[PDB]
RNA sequence: UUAGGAGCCAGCCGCCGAAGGUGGGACAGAUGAUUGGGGUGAAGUCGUAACAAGGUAGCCGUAUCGGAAGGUGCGGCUGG
RNA sequence: GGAGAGUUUGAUCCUGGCUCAGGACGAACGCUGGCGGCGUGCCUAAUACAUGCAAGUCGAGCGGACAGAUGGGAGCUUGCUCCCUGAUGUUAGCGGCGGACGGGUGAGUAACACGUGGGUAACCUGCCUGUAAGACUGGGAUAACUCCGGGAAACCGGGGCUAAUACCGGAUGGUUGUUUGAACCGCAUGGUUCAAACAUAAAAGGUGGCUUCGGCUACCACUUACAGAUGGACCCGCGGCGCAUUAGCUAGUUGGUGAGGUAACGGCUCACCAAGGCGACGAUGCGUAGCCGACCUGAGAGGGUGAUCGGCCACACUGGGACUGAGACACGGCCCAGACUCCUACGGGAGGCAGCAGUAGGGAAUCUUCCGCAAUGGACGAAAGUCUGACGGAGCAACGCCGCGUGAGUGAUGAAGGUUUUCGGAUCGUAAAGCUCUGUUGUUAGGGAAGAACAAGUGCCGUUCGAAUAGGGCGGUACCUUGACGGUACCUAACCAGAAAGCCACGGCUAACUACGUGCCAGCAGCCGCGGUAAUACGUAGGUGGCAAGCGUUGUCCGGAAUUAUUGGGCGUAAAGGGCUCGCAGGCGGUUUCUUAAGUCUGAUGUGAAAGCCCCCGGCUCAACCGGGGAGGGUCAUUGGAAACU
RNA sequence: GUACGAGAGGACCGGGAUGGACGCACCGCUGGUGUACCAGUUGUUCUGCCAAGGGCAUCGCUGGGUAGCUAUGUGCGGACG
RNA sequence: AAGGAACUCGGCAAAAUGACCCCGUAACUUCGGGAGAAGGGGUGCUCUGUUAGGGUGCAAGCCCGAGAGAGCCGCAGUGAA
């Protein structure tokens, strides 16, 4: 309205791109947790590195804000410790 | 953001100024932390009075003033004493 | 390496979810014919109940009757 | 640093009411009104809003357009037309950061919102410094651009082209997590430090110079880490209301465990299990209202108010959600509904003034649709600069405070005139006239501040990097340059008594009185009360008195009101002892001694920001106002003392 | 908006269009009934059982329903003389 | 179908409501009630289940079936009376 139309034209374009980082981060965690219902540790090890690949790059991009991601790390990490 | 700066006081026509360490987010008459002495523009002579020592402790923490405030410190050598500390 | 997988989104789905609708209660205010007292005003009418031993010594509480102030009943009180 | 006065009565003292003198207003109204500083100026409607402006910034992030002519060349009319990319200029879009601050309003909210003191081992912080490290190697897009398509518009869709400090992979990294060791310590969770292992986790270039054309260099930006600086979130004691004709209230309520979730602790969410929690020190409820430094008042204790200026929270037409971003659930952003306004070709859309002004409307009632970014400030940028209804000033209304006037000396004749009169006079009285007088201001013409410090560019010297005396960086000084107010303040000279006073009172409170009119009528009245024919109380006139550019009335709040009495009352009959008991809770304690330190006493430390009150100076022609310094303010916290009293 | 009227008001006479009121007719269309039509579904029995059906439960109930008779549905009717 | 008391002396008649579980309940009150007031909600099938749990028995097995999660179905889910 006061020439801040340029914000909404970018805010929606960022809203698509940010959620693709966010939703793929969610699928990485469940696939690790899929290997918790599954009785596989070696599959969980390579998935933990696959999950933390997205997690560590997530705070590098935008709002995931590491103090969450530390809880995202260790909660996955004790399950591999549980196996 | 932390700008040591002036602060507008006094009557309508003849202003008065106080040199103030504060945050720029607070308004022109906004709040602050601790002040240094004075400024007088309406005197055709002198009487710009500075504490001359307390701001150097703040400059070692880092607080960038505007140049209209800063050249009063040059007139009393606060910055050049501080630049010696930066050369120290 | 002529494409599959990964991931992604459209889409639909679920919980939550504001406003809307429905329903019987709460309280708040205007209003309601008529009535019930309460004061408030020019020499209105009716009595004289108080204040004197007020012409039957008054007075509180209860009961009861009458145009109406009141009346007496019973107990209590001196400010009889 | 503490005044009282009229009134019950035939008369007196008490008792007890109200009345009155005082002080403030963000005040309004009536009558009048000359000026100057300084300050405020929608409280009712957080009701609805025409129009313009109130937040953008970087071509040194980047592609392209866009002009350009340094020259080069072309066709000729000598009038031109060009084709290359000059210096440089413009910035739709892209991307970076800001828009969350600045600014307003006072609706909800009686609670950790705020005020005060705390705690965090339970947290966060882009833009700031300082230190530590750095900044490797690639990739795929896409806007703009066009080319079509669909739309009344709002605009939207499709196909190619393209960029970056945009976006996305690979490496290396002292983040973090995991695993296993150690060391030390706290206040339980624990915390801090050190080692090893594993796992990933980045970054960017741009500007100018120097170049061996490999690059290098400063500077800006970038990634990461440490601290400090910085604000924010959460928790906690202690404070400031009205009602008991509100006594019972709550089931995520209250507990535990685990789980998820949040930057973070948690019923914050959910499962499970338990039945607790909140309460006569007043829960729950309801009406009410933003809080605070402070403002006003009082002698103080207190009481009232919470406007402006300063702190913080909450809200942005009403309600709900959510994104990007360090930070919002976003005042001038999106999405949704609700009302309403506007447009439509009826298919669709756009809109939010409690931003500055202004208008409607409400109401007793509150202002200018100005100029300027010169100073202060912010925003971005390397800077100039740009942007600023913050702010700077101008304009309105006696709205209030303070400051100055409205002539002044002389002048008796007690002029004239007016009023009154026992007709001698009295007063309006030295008041006018006369004479003399200056010019604040009014008027005319001149002169003309400080606010303006600077930045930036030039000059050097110092230091710092540097392949370097390149080239910079800061640091010093030197030159240059910048006014909305405004020729306004101001000062200079010239001009005239010439421009300029009123309202209120006049029995007693209460300073000041007569004459006419008037006859329970007209009318006054705050109080006692005045008038049925001599009204000092009505109305008028004269004359006093009051105060002054104002005066009265009005509504408010405080005071006097010791008349809610802690300081600072009562209870035999004046208003007031419960009809009397038994008593739980709460209230209070004999004597002697030891001890303790909750109360108490006291030091030290930390803090209660600034403005304001107050102590004292200084500045404005004084004042008001403004400035400098200091005190004071806390049932405050920690710490160390004291032991009579509790 | 004419004569008329001061205005306010407001025409006869004459053309065209469209309705209400009842009247005859019908089923193409909106629906209505359609108990020897089809689909689902409950209780219980029966065809040896499952499957798949049958009976009875008011057509068991509920959603549709073709022909048929129907009205509020559609046509025309009381015309011009 | 559209309509709802216009019908009529009048909601007469007829439809509408019903089951069990669960939430919620006013005025007044002789405190017993009023009350099942009203007002709505979930009910079927299959899987976690030879269930949680109970009864019964010596065990073996039988009966009773609480709550949820899952999911499939039709318009409907005490589908009938």
Provide a descriptive summary of the structure in words.
The structure is cut from a larger assembly and holds chains A (83 residues) and B (88 residues). Chain A is an all-alpha fold and 83 residues long. In chain A, 83% of the residues lie in helices and 0% in strands. Chain A is built from three helices and no strands. Chain A is elongated, with a radius of gyration of 16 Å. By secondary structure, chain B is of the alpha+beta class. Chain B has three helices and five strands, in the order E-E-E-E-E-H-H-H. Chain B has a three-stranded antiparallel β-sheet, with no helix packed on it. A two-stranded antiparallel sheet of chain B has the order 2-3. In chain B, a hairpin with a 4-residue loop joins strand 2 and strand 3. In chain B, helix 1 packs across helix 3. The chains hardly touch. The structure holds four RNA strands.
What are the SSEs and their pairings?
The structure is cut from a larger assembly and holds chains A (83 residues) and B (88 residues).
Chain A: H1 5-37, H2 42-61, H3 67-82
Helix pairs in contact in A: 1-2, 1-3, 2-3
Chain B: E1 4-5, E2 8-10, E3 15-17, E4 20-21, E5 34-35, H1 54-61, H2 67-76, H3 78-86
Antiparallel strand pairs in B: 1-4, 2-3, 4-5
Helix pairs in contact in B: 1-3
Chain B binds four RNA strands through strand 2, strand 3, strand 5, helix 1 and helix 2.
Distance between the first and last residues' Cα of chain B: 26 Å
Class inferred from helices and paired strands of chain B: alpha+beta
What is the number of helical segments of chain A per DSSP (H or I, 4+ residues)?
3
Helix content of chain B: 25-40%
- What letter string, H or E per element, gives the SSE order of chain A? HHH
Largest sheet geometry of chain B: 3 strands, antiparallel
> What is the overall shape of chain A?
elongated
């Amino acid at each position: 309205i006061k020439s801040a139309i340029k914000r909404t034209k970018t805010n929606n374009e960022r809203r698509v791109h940010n959620a693709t980082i966010k939703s793929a981060m969610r699928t990485a965690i469940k696939q690790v947790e899929a290997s918790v219902a599954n009785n596989e540790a070696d599959k969980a090890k390579t998935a933990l590195t696959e999950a933390a690949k997205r997690i560590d790059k997530a705070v590098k991009t935008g709002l995931v804000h590491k103090n969450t991601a530390a809880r995202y790390k260790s909660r996955l990490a004790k399950k591999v410790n549980g196996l | 953001a932390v700008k040591i700066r002036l602060k507008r006081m006094g009557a309508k026509k003849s202003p008065f100024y106080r040199i103030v360490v504060a945050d720029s987010r607070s308004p022109r008459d906004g709040r602050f932390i601790e002040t240094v002495g004075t400024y007088n523009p309406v005197a055709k002579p002198a009487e710009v009075k500075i504490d001359e020592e307390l701001a150097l402790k703040w400059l070692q923490t880092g607080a960038k003033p505007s140049d209209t405030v800063r050249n009063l410190f040059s007139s009393q050598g606060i910055m050049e004493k501080f630049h010696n500390a930066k050369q120290g």
